[PDB]
Design a protein around this nucleic acid. Structure first.
Ligand SMILES: *[C@@H]1O[C@H](CO)[C@@H](O[C@@H]2O[C@H](CO)[C@@H](O[C@@H]3O[C@H](CO)[C@@H](O)[C@H](O)[C@@H]3O)[C@H](O)[C@H]2NC(C)=O)[C@H](O)[C@H]1NC(C)=O
Ligand SMILES: *[C@@H]1O[C@H](CO)[C@@H](O[C@@H]2O[C@H](CO)[C@@H](O[C@@H]3O[C@H](CO)[C@@H](O)[C@H](O)[C@@H]3O)[C@H](O)[C@H]2NC(C)=O)[C@H](O)[C@H]1NC(C)=O
Ligand SMILES: *[C@@H]1O[C@H](CO)[C@@H](O[C@@H]2O[C@H](CO)[C@@H](O)[C@H](O)[C@H]2NC(C)=O)[C@H](O)[C@H]1NC(C)=O
Ligand SMILES: *[C@@H]1O[C@H](CO)[C@@H](O[C@@H]2O[C@H](CO)[C@@H](O)[C@H](O)[C@H]2NC(C)=O)[C@H](O)[C@H]1NC(C)=O
Ligand SMILES: *[C@@H]1O[C@H](CO)[C@@H](O[C@@H]2O[C@H](CO)[C@@H](O)[C@H](O)[C@H]2NC(C)=O)[C@H](O)[C@H]1NC(C)=O
Ligand SMILES: *[C@@H]1O[C@H](CO)[C@@H](O[C@@H]2O[C@H](CO)[C@@H](O)[C@H](O)[C@H]2NC(C)=O)[C@H](O)[C@H]1NC(C)=O
Ligand SMILES: *[C@@H]1O[C@H](CO)[C@@H](O[C@@H]2O[C@H](CO)[C@@H](O)[C@H](O)[C@H]2NC(C)=O)[C@H](O)[C@H]1NC(C)=O
Ligand SMILES: *[C@@H]1O[C@H](CO)[C@@H](O[C@@H]2O[C@H](CO)[C@@H](O)[C@H](O)[C@H]2NC(C)=O)[C@H](O)[C@H]1NC(C)=O
Ligand SMILES: *[C@@H]1O[C@H](CO)[C@@H](O[C@@H]2O[C@H](CO)[C@@H](O)[C@H](O)[C@H]2NC(C)=O)[C@H](O)[C@H]1NC(C)=O
Ligand SMILES: *[C@@H]1O[C@H](CO)[C@@H](O[C@@H]2O[C@H](CO)[C@@H](O)[C@H](O)[C@H]2NC(C)=O)[C@H](O)[C@H]1NC(C)=O
Ligand SMILES: *[C@@H]1O[C@H](CO)[C@@H](O[C@@H]2O[C@H](CO)[C@@H](O)[C@H](O)[C@H]2NC(C)=O)[C@H](O)[C@H]1NC(C)=O
Ligand SMILES: *[C@@H]1O[C@H](CO)[C@@H](O)[C@H](O)[C@H]1NC(C)=O
Ligand SMILES: *[C@@H]1O[C@H](CO)[C@@H](O)[C@H](O)[C@H]1NC(C)=O
Ligand SMILES: *[C@@H]1O[C@H](CO)[C@@H](O)[C@H](O)[C@H]1NC(C)=O
Lengths: 751, 753
DNA sequence: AGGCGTTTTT
DNA sequence: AGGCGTTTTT
DNA sequence: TCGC
DNA sequence: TCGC
């Protein structure tokens, strides 16, 4: 019965998870029959500061071992405690087929001895400051070596990490090397020619030429960015570059015939020399972000031959203290025929018209365009209508205000054509701002300042639009023709348009909902809807209504005025009534919800009583969420006979008891969440036979009484596969010595 | 020791408070030595459905008794349970000096017999449908009678309540009568001439003349509103009036020589007849709201003789489905020389011209003007500069967007001020200094809840040379230029809260260096701004005393190496700092040590702290108040309050505190209030405090799962400090053992054991 | 001695 | 039987 | 981190 | 509960 790898948790393919258990030593698993099947062990963020020769002898088949964060270096310790990890010399040699080891975020100053089998090692965020030819001796199979972050502001050293010339040459299967944030002044010498990925960003390598990348002819990805930073844009401490620019020899990259990815971000480059990219037929991903290329991208020839480039990042190439009236991409962009994604965020230019992006408009595969954070105040959005293959254009966080002079957007991820105009300065919508954008399927105007009694004339051209996010505006819902000019509209988010609904004395009107014939998903959430609105919603199409964060409590206190508010939503399948200040809920109010309802959320209300037989008025209910209410027990009835309920969430209540056979008639029941309540026990007699059909039974954060004979232990073991965090997350509230500890910290059957 | 009016709570001036204890009967107070000094008893919202002759015999000196909500009528019951209250006949006669009784929200159908001494009775929201000459017999001293709400949508009846002719005549000291929401078709006949206040609103009295107010010449206040309602404005079920208008005889009120207050709201009036107000020299308060007087107020002579009118409500006199281009108040308004307050909310007119309120501009005592919810899109704000005594003008909830083209709430600081304007909830996107011409006298201005998206830089507020308070909360201000707000020489309180959107732009930074140039600034809020990255690393000031920084990301800022380590330090003199809801998962000593040494109040409410090193309080030498509520503390440990600490209040409520280390509080000589509520304490120990427990003014231990075992030690402590523990009598409850879960620590006696 | 705590990337 | 719960005014 |  |  006992899970067998206590205090850890056994998981799928040979993985034992011991993360976050505050262990001071490698667990012995004494009362397991065999540790021979254990091939992966995770000990993340425990407190193991001392490792011994005998610690892994019983785990001799491990292939994967994670020891991250056991002994954090000073700068990474939340309280800046120094930690020094000791490792006896033969500690890891007992695992003769170990393939992957993570020692990151540990206070070690030298590499311990490791087995020949090792393939992937991380020494990142440690205090190892020298790698010489003895550091990783004999690791002939090593393919991947991370040692990032051993000398920077969060894990400081006085000088720099040193990688001696030829130190890694003996690692002749090494393909991936990462040595970022180490204060290096040069690319280490005589690196293994087998390298395909070299990352040396955020060091102090202010000069590069071909000699620094000698014999590395197998490189596919090279990241040399952040070595001459522009600190005006840094979000973190930033080391001032000694020069105006990274010095890059013209022929630096010419011998890297296989190169596919190059990162030159944050290099303080004021010009592009096309010879950098010459002879790289497979250059696919280029990052030029956070440089000073604002003029260069309007003039350069450097893109002429980049005919296989797929992704290009030009973001935050802004001029200090300036925005530009206009920006015109250079004609050489016309050659980027393979280009799928371009990032032009944060260059800072005030008008967007046909000349800005002219040379992108005929590229046959440009799908994705980022134009955020540019202080754009005039935009001829019509230009996007003749682009060859646009799927997503993001103009969010600009200053567009009109024509030129649970996240709803997840629904749009594989759409034909989505535009994001959120976080702009729109106060009214004029249909002319949409000329030539008839192909749009999805549009966000969220987080604008739209304060308008919409009435059918705002969105005239958008005859293909299926999704519209208008959340976080100040829309006045009043005229019945609102949104009826959108013939294909299926999802409409009107959440966080609360301000008008808070006007005491001015009413509103939802009769428009009845005229939206394709509308399937509607949010009216967080609108402060509480008084002076229409008394009936009506639809034949709406299937999901989010009414979270309103005042239905107050509405259902107004005599019968709002008694049939949801009733005319024929076919409604899901209704969210969370956070509606409900202090009671009458049977008549549930009986007048649509009979089609499969999901009702009452999360985070103030219900301290619930009449369970009233679930018979929701014949089709499969999911009921009553979490965050004030239920004192599960009582005043039982789940009623015939109920189709599949999930009941009654977490985060004040439940102290459950009545006999409470769950027993709910034949379809699969999930029950009882967590964060005040149960002293868990009883088979609450469920009867249906406990064996449950897929999840969550009983964490209950103050379970762990006295010696305790009965619940046998129940939880019988369904152990179905109770999340059983091994160490289900804890006792009493007696005193066991408060806050696992129900398995004592054995409560052996006594 | 035991409080001895258990389970109730004894309060000052003979009040015993038994509210909300779910009692099914009048408590006996057996344990009390004497119940003779009990003069007031409150039993609100208990479950007493049956009252007996013997219930009140020990409480024979009661002067006030409140029994409301004990037996709710069906319509008012939250679950629509029917309730019938039984009352034995001599029940209230045991209290021969009873002066005030509240029987409201109880299912009674008959008035019980009452003592002669009674002065104030409420029978509201009951099921009494008839008052006849026997209902209130012998109550010669009765001054006040409320019986509102016995026949309306929330407490329905079949017909209407009936007050039979002359039923109340024998109550010849009766001064206040209220009979609202009763479905009356007429004012009851032969009411007592002693009446000074008569309220008959929200019935169906569609017709009134002098005959209906016969012989009531002592009236000071008459409320006849809501008898012919306009249902287009109702927030609740509304009965359609049978007529276009309430029918009001011209001389209805003429004989009410002493009348001071008249309510004609929601009467469907399309005209005013001046004869209504004639002969009423002391008319002070007039409510004409929710009528159809949109034309009438631009033309009528009705205000000519209202020379003592102080308050006038014209609100929501709008035309159905219409807003007006313009509006001119009638010249008769010029005569309202006593007028202090005028409410013109919700008429719906789009321009506010210099002329619109021309006839108000010379009234010598007009202090307060309400112009909300009018769909005003053009406004000549300059006119308010010429008004003779304006103290507050409210233009909130309109559509103003700029200068005219025509020819914890910071504003609470402004309630005594000489001149405040509220422009909140308008459509401003940029501020132009010209919108402020002639408003140089303004001391307070709200622009909150607009859409202002502007890199303020010193030129926005030029005319406002006397402005002390500026509320800019809930906008989209771009804090960047150092000259922001430096044109406001007298600015003392600035609210920049809920301007978060710019701070959420990933890759564009901001700058707070402007704060250093605001030389009078005493109170600043940067709350709920998502301030977390790419901002200036130092705030500086010599004047700022209160900074609200709640709802930001200091957690993330203090995880960026040393970049923000001295963020608050240069606020010299800072006295209060709110760092609640800043996603703090840890605090180092250096973080507290680099707050200004002047600090008296620090809030860390609702963070994620599960450790706190108490010896770090020595680095806050002037601290008097510390709020750590809503964190994840598991105990009070890792130090004790240090010697010399000036701490007065410590709130550690709503944590997960299971233990307190010995003498944790002992050296805090100044300590007065400690909140330990909503934790997981099984006990409360004198040894946590030592002798300073006697100097505490509040020790809050509710919602802890106290172990109520037979000898339990905490009981003696709590009794020793009983006047200092809120809700001791019934609100401090046991978690265990099972028999006592959820019950008062005094439900058993835990010493006799 | 070793605590602290769920730790993106810059 | 009585339960429900903090209940402004409309 | 926002016209010269 | 929001022009003609
Ligand atoms: C990574 O390398 C950089 C650059 O070599 C290191 O920063 C440098 O640290 C030196 C010496 O510690 C600084 O000089 C000092 O300046 C202060 C104040 O101006 C002065 O009081 C001292 O006496 C001394 O002269 C130097 O400015 C600084 N260089 C730069 C460009 O920032 C850095 O410490 C190394 N490690 C890390 C973790 O960054
Ligand atoms: C530029 O990128 C292309 C696209 O990947 C490279 O072409 C590919 O090169 C590899 C060799 O690394 C080919 O795989 C091999 O094919 C041979 C011959 O049939 C086989 O014996 C090997 O087992 C191996 O699978 C791959 O098929 C080939 N693909 C195409 C579409 O040609 C190209 O070589 C790159 N150019 C440079 C200069 O790096
Ligand atoms: C694009 O590639 C072509 C061909 O490699 C480059 O043109 C050659 O440049 C070489 C070296 O400078 C000159 O000696 C020749 O005149 C050119 N060769 C041919 C065959 O024309 C061209 O410069 C590249 N364009 C850019 C902007 O880098
Ligand atoms: C919500 O708006 C609708 C449509 O504008 C209003 O319903 C109509 O009201 C008119 C009179 O104003 C009646 O003649 C129609 O019979 C109504 N139509 C329907 C479908 O009901 C309705 O009054 C508004 N609701 C509220 C509460 O303002
Ligand atoms: C049972 O309910 C608890 C309490 O709501 C759930 O725990 C939350 O999980 C979400 C997502 O994992 C997190 O954002 C929160 O950290 C958790 N909340 C609390 C209060 O701890 C839990 O996941 C539910 N159980 C299952 C199996 O779904
Ligand atoms: C109108 O109100 C005034 C002021 O309240 C009344 O004048 C007072 O009358 C009382 C009688 O109760 C005298 O004691 C005072 O001497 C008067 N006070 C002042 C300041 O003049 C006046 O009687 C009221 N008139 C009517 C007809 O009601
Ligand atoms: C305001 O009061 C004056 C009294 O000064 C009213 O004047 C009287 O009006 C009636 C008919 O309108 C005349 O017959 C009298 O001769 C007038 N008497 C005096 C003494 O002037 C005046 O009508 C009142 N105003 C309003 C609008 O009712
Ligand atoms: C916030 O703004 C201040 C003032 O504009 C910046 O400090 C100035 O920086 C300039 C150069 O850009 C220097 O000449 C001076 O040190 C400062 N000038 C003045 C007038 O005080 C500061 O850089 C900004 N803070 C951040 C983080 O950008
Ligand atoms: C001790 O803290 C508790 C819990 O934070 C306080 O209880 C709150 O009191 C207000 C009073 O208006 C209530 O509206 C809230 O519902 C209470 N919150 C909770 C979670 O119960 C209590 O007031 C504090 N004690 C004192 C004396 O201030
Ligand atoms: C905070 O206080 C706790 C409780 O005293 C400390 O944890 C104890 O520390 C000793 C180490 O000297 C252990 O042997 C105990 O088992 C720990 N007890 C518990 C209940 O955890 C903790 O070290 C203190 N934290 C710091 C940073 O000093
Ligand atoms: C809902 O169930 C609870 C718990 O059993 C009921 O409360 C008990 O009612 C009995 C007799 O009616 C009392 O003697 C107990 O003291 C109550 N127990 C507790 C823990 O409060 C409650 O009456 C039920 N309500 C309804 C409406 O059926
Ligand atoms: C690029 O490198 C060449 C090498 O001759 C140099 O002369 C030239 O100045 C550079 N050209 C550009 C376009 O930046
Ligand atoms: C009040 O009067 C109306 C009209 O006579 C009538 O329809 C209704 O029955 C009465 N009761 C209530 C509770 O409104
Ligand atoms: C007001 O009442 C008088 C009688 O006092 C009547 O003759 C007149 O028509 C009424 N005028 C208005 C404007 O209602």
């Amino acid at each position: 019965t006992l899970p067998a790898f206590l205090p850890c948790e056994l998981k799928p393919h040979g993985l034992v998870d011991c993360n976050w258990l505050f262990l001071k030593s490698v667990p012995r698993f004494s009362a397991a029959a065999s540790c021979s099947n254990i091939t992966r062990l995770s000990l993340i963020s425990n407190r193991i500061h001392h490792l011994h020769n005998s610690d892994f002898v019983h785990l001799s088949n491990l292939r994967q071992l994670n020891l991250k964060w056991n002994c954090p270096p000073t700068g990474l310790s939340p309280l800046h405690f120094s930690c020094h990890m000791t490792i006896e010399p033969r500690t890891f040699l007992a695992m003769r087929t170990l393939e992957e080891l993570n020692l990151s975020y540990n206070g070690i100053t030298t590499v311990p001895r490791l087995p020949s089998s090792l393939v992937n090692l991380s020494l990142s965020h440690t205090n190892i400051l020298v790698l010489d030819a003895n550091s990783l001796a004999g690791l002939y199979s090593l393919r991947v070596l991370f040692m990032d972050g051993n000398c920077y502001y969060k894990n400081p050293c006085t000088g720099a990490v040193k990688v001696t010339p030829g130190a890694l040459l003996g690692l002749s299967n090494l393909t991936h090397l990462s040595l970022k944030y180490n204060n290096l002044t040069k690319v280490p010498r005589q690196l293994p020619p087998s390298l395909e990925y070299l990352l040396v960003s955020y060091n102090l390598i202010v000069k590069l030429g071909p000699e620094d990348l000698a014999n590395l002819t197998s490189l596919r990805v090279l990241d040399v960015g952040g070595n001459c930073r522009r600190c005006d844009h840094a979000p973190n401490p930033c080391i001032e570059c000694g020069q105006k620019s990274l010095h890059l020899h013209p022929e630096t990259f010419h011998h890297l015939s296989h190169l596919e990815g190059l990162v030159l971000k944050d290099s303080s480059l004021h010009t592009l020399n096309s010879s950098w990219f010459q002879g790289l037929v497979n250059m696919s991903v280029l990052d030029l972000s956070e440089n000073f290329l604002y003029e260069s991208i309007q003039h350069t020839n450097a893109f002429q031959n980049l005919t296989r480039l797929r992704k290009l990042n030009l973001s935050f190439n802004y001029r200090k203290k300036v925005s530009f009236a206009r920006l015109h991409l250079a004609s050489s962009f016309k050659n980027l025929v393979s280009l799928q994604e371009l990032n032009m965020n944060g260059i800072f230019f005030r008008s967007l018209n046909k000349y800005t992006l002219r040379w992108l408009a005929d590229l046959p595969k440009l799908h994705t365009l980022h134009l955020q954070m540019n202080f754009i105040n005039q935009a001829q959005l019509s230009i996007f209508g003749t682009f060859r293959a646009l799927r997503f254009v993001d103009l969010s966080d600009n200053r567009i205000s009109g024509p030129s002079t649970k996240n709803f957007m997840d629904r749009c991820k594989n759409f034909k054509f989505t535009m994001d105009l959120s976080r702009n300065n729109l106060v009214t919508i004029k249909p002319e701002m949409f000329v030539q954008l008839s192909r749009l399927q999805c549009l966000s105007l969220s987080h604008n300042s739209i304060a308008q009694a919409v009435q059918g004339s705002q969105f005239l051209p958008l005859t293909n639009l299926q999704v519209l996010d208008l959340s976080h505006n100040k829309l006045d819902l009043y005229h019945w023709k609102s949104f009826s000019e959108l013939p294909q509209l299926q999802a409409l988010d009107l959440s966080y348009n609360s301000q008008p609904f808070s006007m005491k004395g001015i009413g509103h009107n939802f009769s428009f909902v009845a005229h939206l014939s394709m509308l399937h998903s509607l949010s009216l959430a967080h609108n402060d809807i509480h008084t002076r609105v229409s008394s009936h919603l009506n639809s034949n199409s709406v299937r999901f209504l989010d009414f979270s964060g309103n005042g239905m409590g107050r509405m259902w206190d107004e005599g019968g005025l709002y008694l049939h508010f949801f009733q005319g939503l024929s076919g409604l399948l899901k209704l969210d009534l969370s956070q509606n200040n409900l202090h009671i809920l009458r049977p008549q109010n549930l009986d007048n919800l649509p009979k089609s309802l499969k999901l009702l959320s009452l999360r985070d209300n103030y219900l301290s009583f619930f009449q369970w037989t009233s679930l018979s008025f929701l014949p089709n209910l499969e999911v009921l969420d009553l979490a965050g209410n004030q239920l004192k027990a599960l009582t005043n009835g039982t789940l009623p006979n015939g109920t189709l309920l599949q999930k009941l969430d009654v977490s985060s209540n004040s439940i102290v008891s459950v009545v006999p056979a409470f769950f027993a008639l709910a034949v379809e029941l699969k999930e029950v969440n009882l967590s964060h309540n005040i149960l002293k026990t868990v009883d088979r007699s609450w469920f009867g036979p249906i406990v064996m059909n449950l897929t999840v039974l969550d009983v964490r954060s209950n103050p379970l009484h762990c006295a010696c004979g305790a009965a619940f232990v046998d129940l939880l073991l019988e369904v152990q596969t179905k109770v999340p965090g059983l091994a160490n997350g289900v804890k006792c509230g009493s007696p005193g010595q066991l408060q806050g500890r696992s129900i398995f910290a004592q054995d409560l059957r052996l006594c």
